[PDB]
Write an enzyme that holds these catalytic residues in place. Structure first.
Site, PDB file in Angstrom:
ATOM      1  N   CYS A   1     -35.299   2.055   9.908  1.00 41.44           N
ATOM      2  CA  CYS A   1     -34.474   2.724   8.550  1.00 41.44           C
ATOM      3  C   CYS A   1     -35.083   4.136   8.132  1.00 41.44           C
ATOM      4  O   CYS A   1     -34.062   4.416   7.288  1.00 41.44           O
ATOM      5  CB  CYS A   1     -35.051   1.331   8.126  1.00 41.44           C
ATOM      6  SG  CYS A   1     -37.454   2.203   7.670  1.00 41.44           S
TER       7      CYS A   1
ATOM      8  N   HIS B   1     -40.885   0.480   3.703  1.00 40.85           N
ATOM      9  CA  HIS B   1     -39.162   0.661   3.959  1.00 40.85           C
ATOM     10  C   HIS B   1     -38.631   2.038   3.981  1.00 40.85           C
ATOM     11  O   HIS B   1     -39.877   2.733   3.250  1.00 40.85           O
ATOM     12  CB  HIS B   1     -38.185  -0.189   3.316  1.00 40.85           C
ATOM     13  CG  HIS B   1     -36.628  -0.319   3.776  1.00 40.85           C
ATOM     14  ND1 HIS B   1     -35.755  -0.005   5.087  1.00 40.85           N
ATOM     15  CD2 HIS B   1     -36.065   0.043   2.711  1.00 40.85           C
ATOM     16  CE1 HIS B   1     -34.934  -0.013   4.853  1.00 40.85           C
ATOM     17  NE2 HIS B   1     -34.837  -0.264   3.490  1.00 40.85           N
TER      18      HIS B   1
ATOM     19  N   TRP C   1     -30.000   1.083   0.795  1.00 40.91           N
ATOM     20  CA  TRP C   1     -31.276   0.817   0.937  1.00 40.91           C
ATOM     21  C   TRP C   1     -30.875   1.314   2.333  1.00 40.91           C
ATOM     22  O   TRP C   1     -32.239   1.267   3.664  1.00 40.91           O
ATOM     23  CB  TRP C   1     -32.032  -0.833   0.904  1.00 40.91           C
ATOM     24  CG  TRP C   1     -32.043  -1.049  -0.505  1.00 40.91           C
ATOM     25  CD1 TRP C   1     -31.500  -1.545  -1.615  1.00 40.91           C
ATOM     26  CD2 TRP C   1     -33.131  -0.706  -0.692  1.00 40.91           C
ATOM     27  NE1 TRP C   1     -32.026  -1.617  -3.025  1.00 40.91           N
ATOM     28  CE2 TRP C   1     -33.368  -1.675  -2.494  1.00 40.91           C
ATOM     29  CE3 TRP C   1     -34.274  -0.309  -0.677  1.00 40.91           C
ATOM     30  CZ2 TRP C   1     -33.965  -1.568  -3.952  1.00 40.91           C
ATOM     31  CZ3 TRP C   1     -36.038  -0.174  -1.990  1.00 40.91           C
ATOM     32  CH2 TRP C   1     -35.273  -0.972  -2.675  1.00 40.91           C
TER      33      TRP C   1
HETATM   34  C1  LIG Z   1     -37.819  -0.046   7.833  1.00 43.16           C
HETATM   35  C2  LIG Z   1     -38.123   0.504   9.430  1.00 43.16           C
HETATM   36  O1  LIG Z   1     -36.879   0.151  10.220  1.00 43.16           O
HETATM   37  C3  LIG Z   1     -39.119  -0.107   9.707  1.00 43.16           C
HETATM   38  C4  LIG Z   1     -39.781  -1.248   9.962  1.00 43.16           C
HETATM   39  C5  LIG Z   1     -40.668  -1.623  10.874  1.00 43.16           C
HETATM   40  C6  LIG Z   1     -39.926  -1.239  11.673  1.00 43.16           C
HETATM   41  C7  LIG Z   1     -41.089  -1.210  13.053  1.00 43.16           C
HETATM   42  C8  LIG Z   1     -43.023  -1.230  12.617  1.00 43.16           C
HETATM   43  C9  LIG Z   1     -43.357  -1.119  11.206  1.00 43.16           C
HETATM   44  N1  LIG Z   1     -44.506  -1.224  11.021  1.00 43.16           N
HETATM   45  O2  LIG Z   1     -45.098  -1.664   9.301  1.00 43.16           O
HETATM   46  O3  LIG Z   1     -45.578  -1.356  11.699  1.00 43.16           O
HETATM   47  C10 LIG Z   1     -42.523  -1.406  10.785  1.00 43.16           C
HETATM   48  N2  LIG Z   1     -40.029   0.271   8.977  1.00 43.16           N
HETATM   49  C11 LIG Z   1     -40.872   1.861   8.735  1.00 43.16           C
HETATM   50  O4  LIG Z   1     -40.569   2.620   9.231  1.00 43.16           O
HETATM   51  O5  LIG Z   1     -41.464   2.256   7.055  1.00 43.16           O
HETATM   52  C12 LIG Z   1     -41.509   3.624   7.745  1.00 43.16           C
HETATM   53  C13 LIG Z   1     -42.811   3.492   6.244  1.00 43.16           C
HETATM   54  C14 LIG Z   1     -42.588   3.641   4.648  1.00 43.16           C
HETATM   55  C15 LIG Z   1     -43.506   3.268   4.054  1.00 43.16           C
HETATM   56  C16 LIG Z   1     -44.317   4.211   4.386  1.00 43.16           C
HETATM   57  C17 LIG Z   1     -44.973   4.474   5.963  1.00 43.16           C
HETATM   58  C18 LIG Z   1     -43.924   4.399   6.287  1.00 43.16           C
END
Ligand SMILES: *CC(=O)[C@H](Cc1cccc([N+](=O)[O-])c1)NC(=O)OCc1ccccc1
Length: 257
Positions: free
Chosen positions: A47, A195, A212
């Site tokens: 994302c 996200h 989103w």
């Molecule tokens: C939105 C997305 O693709 C990703 C989901 C995700 C993938 C692999 C690991 C995790 N994790 O929480 O360990 C999540 N989410 C993402 O990259 O979030 C970025 C982010 C959002 C808010 C704060 C820091 C980083």
């Protein structure tokens, strides 16, 4: 709060994390113990990459990449054999924004699909994407650096953290970006994960338009403290990206535009 009609929707920009956006991400190599196989499928773009790429398409910028990027995946990533190094020759890129289309329905040419997939892969590599069926990045702090150092966006690009501002001053910064036709990278954490997404409009009653990065699903108007899309959450409950919030603002190619 000024009314600003969705900037990305006005330009037809709707990206996702799957095909045909992920045709150049790393191909998953291993089955994670206890999980079904994703071996031989491209990893999700992430994302963070989808959000950043949608904003880059809004500017059709850069024409030329500025600096390569290299990193090594975490050794606890179960989808790849280790060590795994990733490299994007961004300094050699000439991005053709006529081929990087605003959205994809399937009928596009392979050249057009490879064009967005190349941008998605370059952006993900530049933010140290932890690739898998889901793909995670630290987000804002990496995005702001990549946009300037690898992709040549203006020095106005920077991260802002919600905890550093009153609600009024936080929203006024978002509003200022939108008044300058500058979509905002935004991210947050809550009980349905973390996200990253795009704020690109405002309705005048303190709701903001959100893209989103799911191809259109759940896009709409949200309060910045209730970023709660109904496409997420199993079991019927509530959840949204309302904690640890940050944004990347000042995203533009030029000193003034
Ligand atoms: C939105 C997305 O693709 C990703 C989901 C995700 C993938 C692999 C690991 C995790 N994790 O929480 O360990 C999540 N989410 C993402 O990259 O979030 C970025 C982010 C959002 C808010 C704060 C820091 C980083």
């Amino acid at each position: 709060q000024p009314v600003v009609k969705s900037l990305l929707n006005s330009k037809g920009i709707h990206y996702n994390q799957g095909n045909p956006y992920n045709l150049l991400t790393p191909v998953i190599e291993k089955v994670k113990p206890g999980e079904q196989s994703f071996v031989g499928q491209h990893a999700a773009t992430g994302c963070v990459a989808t959000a950043t790429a949608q904003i880059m398409k809004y500017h059709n910028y850069p024409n030329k990449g500025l600096k390569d990027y290299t990193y090594t995946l975490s050794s606890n990533n179960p989808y790849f054999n280790h060590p795994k190094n990733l490299f994007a020759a961004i300094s050699t890129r000439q991005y053709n924004w006529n081929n990087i289309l605003p959205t994809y329905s399937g009928r596009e040419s392979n050249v057009q699909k490879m064009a967005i997939s190349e941008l998605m892969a370059d952006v993900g590599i530049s933010v140290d994407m932890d690739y898998g069926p889901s793909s995670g990045s630290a987000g804002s702090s990496r995005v702001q650096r990549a946009l300037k150092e690898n992709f040549g966006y203006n020095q106005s690009v920077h991260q802002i953290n919600r905890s550093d501002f009153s609600k009024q001053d936080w929203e006024a910064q978002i509003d200022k970006e939108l008044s300058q036709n500058q979509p905002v990278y935004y991210q947050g954490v809550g009980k349905v994960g973390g996200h990253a997404f795009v704020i690109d409009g405002a309705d005048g009653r303190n709701f903001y338009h959100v893209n989103w990065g799911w191809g259109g699903v759940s896009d709409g108007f949200f309060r910045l403290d209730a970023l709660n899309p109904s496409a997420l959450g199993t079991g019927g409950g509530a959840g949204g990206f309302n904690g640890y919030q940050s944004a990347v603002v000042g995203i533009k190619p030029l000193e003034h535009h």
